[PDB]
Design a protein around this nucleic acid. Sequence first.
DNA 1: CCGAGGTCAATGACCTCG
DNA 2: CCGAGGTCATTGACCTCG
Lengths: 78, 86
Amino acid sequence: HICAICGDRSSGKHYGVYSCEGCKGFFKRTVRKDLTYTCRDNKDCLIDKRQRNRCQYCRYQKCLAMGMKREAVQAAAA
Amino acid sequence: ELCLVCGDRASGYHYNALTCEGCKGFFRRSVTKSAVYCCKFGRACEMDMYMRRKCQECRLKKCLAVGMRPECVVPENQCAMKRREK
DNA sequence: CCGAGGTCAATGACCTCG
DNA sequence: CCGAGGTCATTGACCTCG
Ligand SMILES: [Zn+2]
Ligand SMILES: [Zn+2]
Ligand SMILES: [Zn+2]
Ligand SMILES: [Zn+2]
């Protein structure tokens, strides 16, 4: 399958959307420690298998815009 | 403004070639520990922001081909006095 | 197999000196 | 003011578990 957030390979659905190892973890750490990013431009940041790390704010936001949410919130160590 | 290795944004000249921060650091690591990477696919991977992180053998071949020189990595000059700090 | 969890070497942003 | 020579938080490959 294809990561719906970047076009990278997908192991399978993660937190509710075909994603890649990269995106699964990015999302987890973001929700798990509840982080707030900023962004330098708008939300307009591109994002794909190549530029996904150029703007964390826009990466998380694209994750939201395709699935995921609570789910990942599996508390710590569970 | 472009890293000759991967095409990312160059931060300047690192070891005599115009590159980006990651290629800079990965060259450093690669030389200082005389690394020998081996390609999975066919040793011919083209480099971009994605791929660079996927093929070490090919990222180094290129660092090298683009003019980045090893001899400039911790050369045996002075400042090798940090080696004298216990 | 699938989708949670977790691990950790490598990576790359940022920093300090020369 | 660049750039060499690092430091350390973040990334994401690859496992265990129900
Ligand atoms: Zn992705
Ligand atoms: Zn952005
Ligand atoms: Zn580069
Ligand atoms: Zn290769």
